[PDB]
From Swiss-Prot, chains A, B, C, D:
It holds the Pfam family Ion_trans. Changing residue 227 to A: Loss of channel activity. The keyword Oxidoreductase does not apply. Residues 1-12, 62-74, 113-129, 211-355 are cytoplasmic. Its main location: membrane. PANTHER family: CYCLIC NUCLEOTIDE-GATED CATION CHANNEL SUBUNIT A. Keywords: cAMP, cAMP-binding, Cell membrane, Ion channel, Ion transport, Ligand-gated ion channel, Membrane, Nucleotide-binding, Potassium, Potassium channel, Potassium transport, Transmembrane, Transmembrane helix, Transport. Changing residue 203 to A: Increased channel conductance. Homotetramer. This is Cyclic nucleotide-gated potassium channel mll3241. SUPFAM superfamilies: cAMP-binding domain-like, Voltage-gated potassium channels. Changing residue 348 to A: Loss of cAMP binding. Loss of channel activity.
């Protein structure tokens, strides 16, 4: 609610082309298709092939920024990006070679930031996952067997075995309800009463395990990435040691592209930012274009009012952001700093129209 | 648990009439219907048409309160509120013109406060949503394909393609279980074992993303709306800077209409309020009708007892509210203020029966 | 994890008999039943009828503890507990009179503490619920209509109307998958892709609303019920104002019945309690039976060891409880109090075997 | 995200063999199976029988570490581990004796740490569970009956009774959708509208109850297990009383086996550890193998850089771990301690290459 994320966060065309590229699979897969567009899209694979392949050798030129890097991951597919289709072209002379369109599916995961963020925490908590997972396996065959107890007589063809009941186990326990083979008798129907009650407690915990400290990591991700952009501010020599830990939980940084709007005039004032790199378009009669290491909105927070400038991104600005309360926290945290935001709440009233 | 929300929070008849209005759709949609009430309700559209249309021009008189306003949203439908049915009346000479009863469906969302509260936070966290959404797309075709591997031989008509398996993908992954086309073999049935385990982890995270900082916003909404109603209290010059940030998390403000009851006598005392605007009905032999900037319940909290007055809303009062602990926090937070709540715990014992 | 709840929390036989009582419904409901046990259980209604009716008049003697009470709730069913069956006996001369066995179903909710705890918070947050509920209604007909767009031609009999699609709406959106009427075409099948994605976000929020501050109330319930049992401890005159608010979040109180076990000897020491009312069975050669306002386990916490006594409930003790950390919080919170728990960690070593 | 869990957390072969052992069930359960491998796996039971039985008597030698122990749990199955199959071998002369392969299913739960962690908290909160559980039973028959109201006429064979509707109750309320017997009329179909809305609120709370303080316990489990490994550090005499309670929430301890890698050189520096027992492989020209009571990474945190050593586990090290922020918390928490981490940030620069 307090951040301006822009400048094509879904930027690189590498990540893009799997989306169109894989949809070209389908028409090959389907009878009653004229051969015209059958192969027209086979090129389009050869395009993205050629295109990543065009990208490829430039990537293998890893002499750019070659100081200290661990690029086993980013290359791990680029290799197979182009070979697996290729040998597929020959040894699978039949059209099925296209079925190696499962292969690009890591290309998003090549440049998927937020995926290593996933895998990072699985390696702390999987202790639980297993003890749950086993326990999921506990409750499975604990219960799956209890049907084999019963309907083997009148439902051999459906419940004449164990795994056929393990089939009906997780279909039942995992909230689903397919609806192919269901009991008939009383007691076998009784047993269901704890099942949903159970499984929704199980995943009641287990999927809960995921978000549990995942959010910590993401709520940590916004710190670790933002103990940066701290000392840049010329004013933060006087902030206290413990003061920051409160703050930076909320402060998210994002970039804005050139030309974009930052805050429009006349809209109600709700938030202030800290500029740390770039330049702005403070639309006043004399544009107060503030450079790296600036801020604005105290005019809008201390008074509780609409905006004093249609501020727009003159350049690609790496922005911070902060709503009122946690700025009221700051002005409450120290009378030292509210002095200059009191002064600046008078200076920028005339510095805006003047130079 | 600590708030008195009243005075028709679902107030305006603009938001209302879509509810009855759209149900008039149905009878047109149905064979074997006499033409009598077929058209009787077509008027009822023409009513709400005429009614919003009656409202309309008065809304286009935006010379009321015309100081600084951004009403592109609120008008955005009022325009189409009345035209879209109208041109529909002619060009769609057939009865299908009523099918533009999808159009009013934003009229609730016209005056739906709490909906911009939704959209505010989507523009901070959608970075995640996409990386999840892609990742949802990752796992989809990662898995959907694995059925095309198998049942193309004996289930052409069901699993003779890719998208037919992508159909069975999200039906399966999204907790559902339609129950039309299900595998037969072993290994194809094996693959399900991670699916529900997966998707309930996925939405285990993803829908979790929604409530995650949404609650922050709503838990923030109760601050931002309530850094107001602070300085009104004549006693809050001595409260500390950091003191407030703790408090206002809990303090919710709501309005009560005239005539309503606020706290009934004899019921156990559990909460105290801060009056800031309006007047009350403190039912005593001499009603101590306290105006803006008042409170009551310390008689009920410091002793731990039932109520001393059937306090009722003599007028439309904008109320605050506060349970004990966080008032015990306050009396614990400072011996300065408990003095006057000690005194007031004696004054109001006799001021209640006296004047 | 830190509480000993015992003494028949599901105590009163009033709440009990609905459970057996209502199961007597069934056999009446079923063809091919001999008349023998048909009516044998009709008495059993007449029993619980007579039994609550026996209870009844004693309840109408509300001259016990008649100081200040609001018993409109508790009586609200006892009235209808016995009349509704009665007039049902005559006017419904046919056996269907038993179908007023929906009536006792509030009798649990008569003495269901934890149910008013539910209703308390619905009256704060229903502002959201409605704006969601409407929004649920928004998305419903927003989408339900989109099927009427399509399959009216080849599925008149299933999708030849609006509500038949609203039927398939919430079946689909609410995670279910009945599996009666499903589309056939492409685009109508496309639309599902956001649905589960949506509804699991919707209830992703909405059911989240319930637990959201519900837990606050229950986490508050353990305070409000436990600002009691504070001043009873003779040692809590020196605890700081803010000190308590941290603590009492964790401290839950429960009662134990006479004869029961409290902590068994030899088991690892993990928790200590504060006795405030009753007496114990500290099994030592000289039983140190401590009365109201006592504690034990510092021998087990300061050393990090197993138990020094098979302490058992000599009487009905209202207990508190506290694990280590939050007691380590206390010994960390003040060197003042650890002195006497240092001394008591020597006194009780010999006071246990001595008198 | 901040822990290195290794050394076969799924270690003991006791817990293992149920997994293979129980899968041998299946082939016995299936017609059209040659008798060859029918019995080959019956030995494999006799193996694990013999194997646990081999383990058994060594376990009954509970003269190892026999100081104070409560091993009623761990033995509780080892008894039945071997008898229940045995008497099953004779009295169940028919092959069904194998159906006592439900019996080992506690053997994982024998050595399942994290399962007593489950049961610990159920004995605090089941007060709620019941009041919910009853309330689940409230809403069940509250609603299940409402179908018997209706479809008894035209659906005797499906809805000609109560429990047949209670069948359709929880199938419906518990998010499932089997899809066998569904209404036809209007009003009976209306009633569903609150059901999913309800049940997802119910489990909206109820399964929420599980994770609610479960996470407290697990977030407590990482304290209680880690008030240990505190005084071992020679430097923690000066840390404040309240200082620790913040810290140890985050500090998780895990063990690493000999030979494993701890932090690889060149990777970006993100975390530091506290060694408390064992030895390391700090790969430098002169390996600075630090023993119990050591740490490393301040070189990587104070500068914000990659790693200075491919530190690898020379021995089985019981490790702690700590990311930056909470170490920035520490260096912020006291200028006293940052002095020696300033000095050590110079000493280890040359102590690494020197001895
Ligand atoms: K389902
Ligand atoms: K189904």
């Amino acid at each position: 609610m307090s951040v301006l994320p822009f400048l094509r966060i879904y930027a690189p065309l590498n990540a893009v082309l799997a989306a169109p590229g894989l949809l070209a699979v389908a028409a090959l897969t389907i009878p009653d298709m004229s051969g015209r567009s059958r192969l027209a899209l086979a090129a389009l694979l050869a395009v993205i092939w050629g295109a990543y392949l065009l990208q490829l050798a430039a990537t293998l030129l890893k002499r750019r920024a070659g100081v200290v890097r661990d690029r086993t991951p980013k290359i791990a597919i680029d290799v197979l990006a182009v070979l697996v289709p290729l040998a597929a072209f020959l040894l699978d002379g039949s059209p099925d070679w296209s079925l190696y369109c499962a292969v690009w599916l890591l290309k998003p995961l090549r440049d998927s930031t937020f995926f290593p963020v996933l895998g990072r925490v699985l390696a702390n908590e999987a202790r639980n996952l297993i003890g749950v997972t086993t326990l999921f396996g506990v409750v499975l065959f604990a219960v799956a067997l209890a049907a084999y107890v019963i309907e083997r007589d009148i439902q051999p063809e459906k419940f004449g075995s164990i795994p056929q009941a393990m089939w009906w186990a997780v279909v039942t326990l995992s909230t689903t309800g397919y609806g192919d083979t269901i009991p008939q008798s009383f007691a076998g129907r009784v047993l269901a009463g704890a099942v949903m009650m159970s499984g929704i407690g199980i995943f009641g915990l287990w999927a809960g395990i995921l978000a549990t400290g995942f959010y910590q990591e993401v709520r940590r991700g916004d710190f670790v990435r933002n103990w940066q952009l701290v000392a840049a501010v010329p004013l933060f020599q006087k902030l206290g040691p413990a003061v920051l830990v409160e703050i930076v939980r909320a402060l998210r940084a994002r970039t804005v592209p050139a030309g974009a709007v930052i805050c429009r005039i006349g809209e109600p004032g709700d938030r202030m930012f800290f500029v740390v790199e770039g330049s702005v378009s403070v639309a006043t009669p004399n544009p107060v274009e503030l450079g790296p290491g600036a801020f604005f909105g105290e005019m809008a927070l201390i008074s509780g009012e609409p905006r004093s400038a249609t501020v727009s991104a003159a350049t690609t600005v790496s922005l911070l952001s902060l709503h009122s309360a946690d700025f009221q926290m700051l002005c409450s945290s120290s009378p030292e700093i509210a002095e200059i935001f009191r002064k600046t709440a008078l200076e920028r009233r005339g510095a805006a129209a003047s130079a």
